[PDB]
Amino acid sequence: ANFVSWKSRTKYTITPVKMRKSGGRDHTGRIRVHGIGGGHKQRYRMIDFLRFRPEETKSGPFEEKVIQVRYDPCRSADIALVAGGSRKRWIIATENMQAGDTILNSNHIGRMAVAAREGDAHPLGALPVGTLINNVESEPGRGAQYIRAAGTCGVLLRKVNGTAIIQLPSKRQMQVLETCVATVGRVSNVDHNKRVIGKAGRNRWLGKRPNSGRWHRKGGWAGRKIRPLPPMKSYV
Amino acid sequence: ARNVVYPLYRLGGPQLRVFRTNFFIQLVRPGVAQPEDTVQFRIPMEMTRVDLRNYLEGIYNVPVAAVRTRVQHGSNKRRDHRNVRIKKPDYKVAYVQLAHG
Amino acid sequence: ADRMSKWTSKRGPRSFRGRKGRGAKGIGFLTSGWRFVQIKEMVPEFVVPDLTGFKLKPYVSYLAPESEETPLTAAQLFSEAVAPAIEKDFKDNLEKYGFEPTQEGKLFQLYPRNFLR
Amino acid sequence: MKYMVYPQTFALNADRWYQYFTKTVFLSGLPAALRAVACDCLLQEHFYLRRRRRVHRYEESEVISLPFLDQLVSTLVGLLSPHNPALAAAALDYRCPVHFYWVRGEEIIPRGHRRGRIDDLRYQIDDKPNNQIRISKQLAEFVPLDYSVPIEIPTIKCKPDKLPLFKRQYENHIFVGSKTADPCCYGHTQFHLLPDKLRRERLLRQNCADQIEVVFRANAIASLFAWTGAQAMYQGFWSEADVTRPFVSQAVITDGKYFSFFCYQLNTLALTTQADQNNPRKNICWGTQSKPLYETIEDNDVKGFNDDVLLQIVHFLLNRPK
Amino acid sequence: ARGNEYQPSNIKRKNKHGWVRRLSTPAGVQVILRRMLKGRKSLSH
Amino acid sequence: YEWGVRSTRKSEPPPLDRVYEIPGLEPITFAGKMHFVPWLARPIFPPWDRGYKDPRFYRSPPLHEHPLYKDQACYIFHHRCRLLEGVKQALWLTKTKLIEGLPEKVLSLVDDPRNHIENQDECVLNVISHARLWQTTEEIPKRETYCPVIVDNLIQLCKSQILKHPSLARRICVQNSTFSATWNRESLLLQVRGSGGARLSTKDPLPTIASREEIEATKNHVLETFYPISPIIDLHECNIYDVKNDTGFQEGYPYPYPHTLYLLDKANLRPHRLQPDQLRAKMILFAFGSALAQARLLYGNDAKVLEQPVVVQSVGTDGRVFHFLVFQLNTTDLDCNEGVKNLAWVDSDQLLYQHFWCLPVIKKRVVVEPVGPVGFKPETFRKFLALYLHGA
Amino acid sequence: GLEEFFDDPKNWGQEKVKSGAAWTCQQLRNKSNEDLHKLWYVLLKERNMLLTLEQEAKRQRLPMPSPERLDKVVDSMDALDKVVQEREDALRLLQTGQERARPGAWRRDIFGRIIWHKFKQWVIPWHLNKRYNRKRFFALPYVDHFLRLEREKRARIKARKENLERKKAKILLKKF
RNA sequence: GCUAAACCUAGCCCCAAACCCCACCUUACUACCAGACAACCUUAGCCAAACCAUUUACAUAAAGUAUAGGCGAUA
RNA sequence: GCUACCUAAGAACAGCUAAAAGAGCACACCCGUCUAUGUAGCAAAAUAGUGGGAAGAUUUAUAGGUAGAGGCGACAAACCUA
RNA sequence: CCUCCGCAUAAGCCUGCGUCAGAUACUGACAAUUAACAGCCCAAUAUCUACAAUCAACCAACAAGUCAUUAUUACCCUCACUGUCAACCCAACACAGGCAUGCUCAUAAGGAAAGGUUAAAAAAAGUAAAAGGAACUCGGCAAAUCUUACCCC
Ligand SMILES: [Mg+2]
Ligand SMILES: [Mg+2]
Ligand SMILES: [Mg+2]
Ligand SMILES: [Mg+2]
Ligand SMILES: [Mg+2]
Ligand SMILES: [Mg+2]
Ligand SMILES: [Mg+2]
Ligand SMILES: [Mg+2]
Ligand SMILES: [Mg+2]
Ligand SMILES: [Mg+2]
Ligand SMILES: [Mg+2]
Ligand SMILES: [Mg+2]
Ligand SMILES: [Mg+2]
Ligand SMILES: [Mg+2]
Ligand SMILES: [Mg+2]
Ligand SMILES: [Mg+2]
């Protein structure tokens, strides 16, 4: 096939980017994932998951102003247009994030624990134990990859050594270098879990094609499986 | 000229000149009523209307006011004894409006 | 469905019909807004001579002698053009006699030919 | 399917063909601070106004003359409003479309499943005059209705197609520049700017030196006929209800330097064969040869400004309804 | 109901069975070679 | 996270043949063949550049080598700049104090009934109806058509007052006029390159509104700052510029003095259309730019308090909503954040009409709302006429 | 003038129009380059007139008066073109040694056939020309079988022709 | 007495000998713009073994011999 | 180039009731419930009447994609040039 | 008397009811469709582009949406090429089928159900029908009317 990924943009921007649906088809053209196809046309809004990204020629902790909080078609959680210095950028909005709020992004790990305030980004080592976090990075400077869905909140359990233990929303524990940044509070759109589709048409709008009509026998995997919680996933 | 490679022109190059013209044209009687100042020609397919204007103004010193061209499609419907279509050649028709009334 | 008929600009959708031509050599280029810029130097300029006083009618009198065909050759042209000067200056740097080391720098380059007809 | 008639036309001798299509007779002629302001507009659009982007000849018309003509119309209207009270309440339109659809003559279908059947010859004029003035009170007739003129309308011995003229089927529009609900329904003056394709220099190169006046005349005839016919049909007249009063309009057509002045009187909407079989009426278009407003503009000075041309424009703007 | 499976369109015709597409892949080159060997008057579509 | 995926990024050239790596031997490549063959080494073609200069195939020099490249970055505000903080940002950039409402000096020019146009309401209703319904053959004219038309028709209606005010013959309405003005604020080089809307140009300067006492009183007023948003946000940062103060016209041009900047937001789409606050900020910046260009032309390129303040009006509009501004530039000493400050009187969100019904809304075969404007506000047109008549 | 597109008015309608002999190559070779240049346009005007006569005769469904003079004019123009080409070729050979005016090269196309690719005029070098690089001038191994098959088809055709010729010759000898 | 009947050479088969102007890869037959992309990789199966599963052929003489082979079809 | 699904960017949906509805009646349009005719037929699946939907999970024009040990499938072992 | 229509564009086709002459909507020859409509575009390097549409105004939203540049450098000096016909395409056919869009919403445009006769059966379509009103039939299928209530899934 001649499939070329629409994700060719190289420069970050605030403008919604015109996407191209895949319908679950790989670059070879064959279906790789079923149940995807159609739905309302959407435009991608480039999200800056590296919350501590000091502006060019600048460094150190910096503040920003929340211009607005906007529904994002590409994400369960709604996003926020956060502007600082002479730049703007899309970020993941926390639960109680309103327009006009001030958001602090710092890389400083003080000897004491910073007073956690919802919406700000601090290194995990700077947070008090037990604070609710989101948009956690696997490695320092990698960028947020975990706890990004609507209403998801990780927990800061321990800060042994130069490492921090994070309870992910799936309850799995995660060891990360304390220098990696994570935002305070739970992700916005907390009531996303209580959304009623109502009609098959709404699923088709969202872009989920109906399940296959073929009847499958349920094997040994089907029965409820109670397992011990998996061990910590370490990144040190 | 036709059936000849035109020397490629680059910006600032010399003027393209043809010395022994290869275009041969026909002055044909119009098949329909035409204005008194209009002359109908059958032209080689590779000749532009600018080429026809220069041709008439240089070789025949005919003051040309306007030129229009159209590609008449020759019929391919006729068939020989072998049932193979006989192609009537397509030809270009040029309508030239004379100047100075 | 017709494969034996010639492919012309009269066949195909609007894009095909507009894009394909009929062999006419280009005269200029296209700029923004589909505006055509015509380059004068790209228009063939018919170098028509002055026929006044010309004595060669299109046909030749049938009362004319017949002569054997002697196609001109490089050797014959050299003998009839360069050989006399070569002999004179030998009895008494080929550029002086006429040889041109390179066609570059000429308006009419013999090879690669850069002139019409 | 109908012939699309282009007022500003590259067709040669198009004035005679338009005269035939319109039943119009063409007649040569017509039935200090202002000078300073005109020179000010010229110098504003040529020298004083700084251009960020370089101006090319192929866009010189649009980016120089069109603002120049707009400035002339606006400033002259403002300055002559005291001397023409009706001009004060007039509505000034910039490049507003003027559409007129009519029927003139009949033709036997040459080929097809409809061969041999009689079909009317429909024409549509879609003009975009650079400026135009619309009023609520109609102008006075230039010459009484039924004005018999010895000059005979030109006749076309071949099809209208032979003059470059092509047929299309799209919306039939009769439009004076504003919808019928607009009180300002009558026409006062139309300022036309000839396009670059119809440059005097281009015509001279193409050996159409005889066709400059032809282009001006054809543009005038077509545009003014369309405007007057649209006004008449807004008033309710049509082919079977021919106008009971003449419908007058004026036009000035310029190439940027040369101006020509035209007066048009519509006396006939009965252009179809049925309504024209025994119709003595015929529309009239008075026109003047193109004259240069100025000879040349050198830096900060305009050379040889034509007070006569300026006064012609002023007189057209000063014409008032009775 | 059936029979009219051919909905002609020159774009599809040339993009599916054209000279360029036939030469694009080695298999199509061999198709053209087979047509030439057989002596077909129409190598491509 | 790096934007742009590998599959879309330019493909890496294939690895070079080991024949090139081998030192002492000259590789055999298909360069002589003048075409690719898979069984010969790939040539290393030397870089090529056409000997002659060819427009339509011209590549600009790299940015740093441009003659006008400068390390100091100039922040340019143009017709399509949408300030994030809007009016606050414009006021900070221009060192301006805001006064709500138009000044009494201009507002009183329409109080006297003589300046009142005959049949103001009917004429303005006709103008609105022509702009919004009767303009074109299209059933519902678009903003791109009815915004410039409504502005021009209102200007013509005002110009009809030449009978009462002969001084209106000393002004013209120029289009495509562009001005440029540069100045420093807190060591930030800011330029305004204003183009687009129409410019009313008079033969005489506008009289000053604020008195010297008020100008001095502006000293106590302090520019409202906004943190962490910098005043530079949304302004085009440019390292290749030319610091020049251009009034848009050659010297000696008649009608030199700007009198009103008629700015129109004729974009059909809401996102492409300026917000009211951003439009007011644009009006502030363009009025300041024109006034500063006039000041630089007249009193030279000197940072000083103007003894004769420059007055420039502006009318921003979206076809329905209008914003009126009168800007008095009384100081070219913009770098310092303290001292006398320019001052702008603003009247915001003056809507000429609430809505226009191009078609008659019918409910159960009953016409609920007739065709035409609804909620017409003649006060907005009175303010428009007051601004037009100011100076005459 | 347009009258040059038609024969003499006196000649109009004549059943037969007498014409001289077509120019011969040897006769033309004695004429100067300027003389040949002028004679080319003389013959071009005559050819246009004769083609006009032919088309009008077809329109009127009548024979063209003296059709042979059109062939005479075509032959004269061909001879003039041949003489000019001979002079140009001799000069090119003398000054450069190239026997072809247009550059070209023997190249193997995608089908394995050896062709004379005639070079075209380009503004950019070949290694940068995208379309030229798309064009392929080499045959992959899978073409060898088809090359052999085409060779064998040609050999079969030639063998059939030769055997038929021998059979016909033997029949002729037996008959006579 | 109508449909019709016939006809002899167009050619072909097997051997020997002998080795064989312009346009066109873009939508081919399209004058005239920054490429980068490049080829190689066991045949399988039918079928026979009366199924099928290992297996099953692709000058003369030695010789259908030595050998191989569900030691069997066969090789 | 049919058809199954998908990709890009388009188009269509009168009127009435209701009111932001995979709402109702009902055109265009899509489909094909039942009857009759037809069964070498107008048609290698149609016609007439009747009927379901007809602002949506709709219909549909254009171009592109997925290829047989496969594709696609709201599984009918459907459809992939009769 | 009919009018589903029809006229254009798109797509498709490619001269396929124009004239002349021969034959017996065919053959041969001659002619034709003329650009303004449409196609055929854009010099770079960076840098911009949060705020639907729905008469866009209230409102209501969700499925979150077709519509934008600037800065510098280059650059004007010279309107080509191609489609344009038709009773037309996909269905082996002058096939009752398939066939996108804009107007016309019954027409100004486009058409003809009857080769002539007779008025047998059988057959098809339709209309009317005394009294009865499902007694027919597997079943109210069909037709005619506009019609209640209860179940299974
Ligand atoms: Mg299931
Ligand atoms: Mg054309
Ligand atoms: Mg289809
Ligand atoms: Mg077996
Ligand atoms: Mg057996
Ligand atoms: Mg509806
Ligand atoms: Mg519904
Ligand atoms: Mg099943
Ligand atoms: Mg089953
Ligand atoms: Mg009949
Ligand atoms: Mg009968
Ligand atoms: Mg009964
Ligand atoms: Mg019963
Ligand atoms: Mg009952
Ligand atoms: Mg019974
Ligand atoms: Mg029933």
Side-chain angles (χ1 to χ4, degrees), chain D residues 6 9 52-53 57 111 113-115 117 164 169:
Chain D
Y6 279 97
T9 180
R52 281 285 299 274
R53 181 64 171 92
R57 74 180 190 279
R111 276 177 43 79
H113 72 287
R114 306 173 56 183
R115 181 164 65 94
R117 288 172 199 173
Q169 171 170 337

Side-chain angles (χ1 to χ4, degrees), chain D residues 83-104:
Chain D
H83 311 81
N84 188 353
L87 192 64
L92 179 62
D93 299 358
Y94 306 90
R95 288 158 295 279
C96 275
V98 168
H99 302 291
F100 189 56
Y101 159 85
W102 79 101
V103 166
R104 166 64 162 171

Side-chain angles (χ1 to χ4, degrees), chain D residues 203-273:
Chain D
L203 296 172
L204 289 168
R205 286 203 273 95
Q206 298 295 109
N207 274 356
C208 301
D210 175 41
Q211 306 285 324
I212 296 90
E213 306 312 326
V214 167
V215 168
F216 283 103
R217 195 178 307 119
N219 182 0
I221 289 162
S223 189
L224 282 175
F225 165 59
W227 204 26
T228 50
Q231 295 162 37
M233 297 193 73
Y234 273 35
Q235 290 313 296
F237 307 112
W238 54 294
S239 65
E240 305 295 320
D242 209 351
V243 302
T244 63
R245 51 191 147 97
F247 276 76
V248 169
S249 296
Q250 310 168 133
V252 299
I253 309 179
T254 187
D255 54 21
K257 180 188 297 187
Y258 299 83
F259 287 71
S260 54
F261 306 84
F262 298 86
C263 280
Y264 191 92
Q265 180 168 303
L266 179 74
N267 299 329
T268 306
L269 288 177
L271 278 296
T272 72
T273 47

Side-chain angles (χ1 to χ4, degrees), chain D residues 56-279:
Chain D
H56 305 293
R57 74 180 190 279
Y58 71 87
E59 58 191 6
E60 266 180 2
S61 177
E62 291 78 31
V63 310
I64 309 288
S65 189
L66 175 149
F68 158 58
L69 199 54
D70 292 11
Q71 291 294 320
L72 273 188
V73 176
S74 179
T75 56
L76 284 186
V77 163
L79 295 163
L80 281 297
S81 179
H83 311 81
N84 188 353
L87 192 64
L92 179 62
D93 299 358
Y94 306 90
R95 288 158 295 279
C96 275
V98 168
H99 302 291
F100 189 56
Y101 159 85
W102 79 101
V103 166
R104 166 64 162 171
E106 269 176 348
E107 186 215 19
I108 299 291
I109 299 285
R111 276 177 43 79
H113 72 287
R114 306 173 56 183
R115 181 164 65 94
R117 288 172 199 173
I118 198 74
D119 202 15
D120 311 319
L121 291 175
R122 299 157 283 270
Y123 304 82
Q124 165 79 59
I125 285 172
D126 307 313
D127 201 358
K128 203 171 284 294
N130 196 31
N131 305 281
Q132 70 169 358
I133 305 171
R134 280 183 299 97
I135 49 184
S136 58
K137 306 286 292 306
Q138 189 181 348
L139 287 175
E141 67 186 3
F142 287 148
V143 72
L145 194 86
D146 315 308
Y147 170 70
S148 54
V149 65
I151 297 89
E152 188 45 62
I153 295 161
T155 179
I156 299 306
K157 314 178 186 181
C158 63
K159 286 181 63 173
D161 279 315
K162 306 315 170 187
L163 183 90
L165 200 73
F166 309 86
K167 306 172 70 60
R168 272 181 64 239
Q169 171 170 337
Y170 57 102
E171 291 83 4
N172 304 341
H173 277 156
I174 296 161
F175 195 69
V176 305
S178 195
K179 283 175 176 158
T180 62
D182 196 307
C184 287
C185 54
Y186 299 111
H188 194 274
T189 303
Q190 270 184 345
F191 299 69
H192 294 96
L193 175 64
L194 292 181
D196 275 322
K197 181 187 282 182
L198 280 297
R199 275 197 308 274
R200 184 173 304 246
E201 292 75 40
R202 215 189 89 80
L203 296 172
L204 289 168
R205 286 203 273 95
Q206 298 295 109
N207 274 356
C208 301
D210 175 41
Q211 306 285 324
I212 296 90
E213 306 312 326
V214 167
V215 168
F216 283 103
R217 195 178 307 119
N219 182 0
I221 289 162
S223 189
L224 282 175
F225 165 59
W227 204 26
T228 50
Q231 295 162 37
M233 297 193 73
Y234 273 35
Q235 290 313 296
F237 307 112
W238 54 294
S239 65
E240 305 295 320
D242 209 351
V243 302
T244 63
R245 51 191 147 97
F247 276 76
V248 169
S249 296
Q250 310 168 133
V252 299
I253 309 179
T254 187
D255 54 21
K257 180 188 297 187
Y258 299 83
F259 287 71
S260 54
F261 306 84
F262 298 86
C263 280
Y264 191 92
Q265 180 168 303
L266 179 74
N267 299 329
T268 306
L269 288 177
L271 278 296
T272 72
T273 47
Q274 176 198 358
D276 204 51
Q277 63 196 12
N278 298 313
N279 193 358

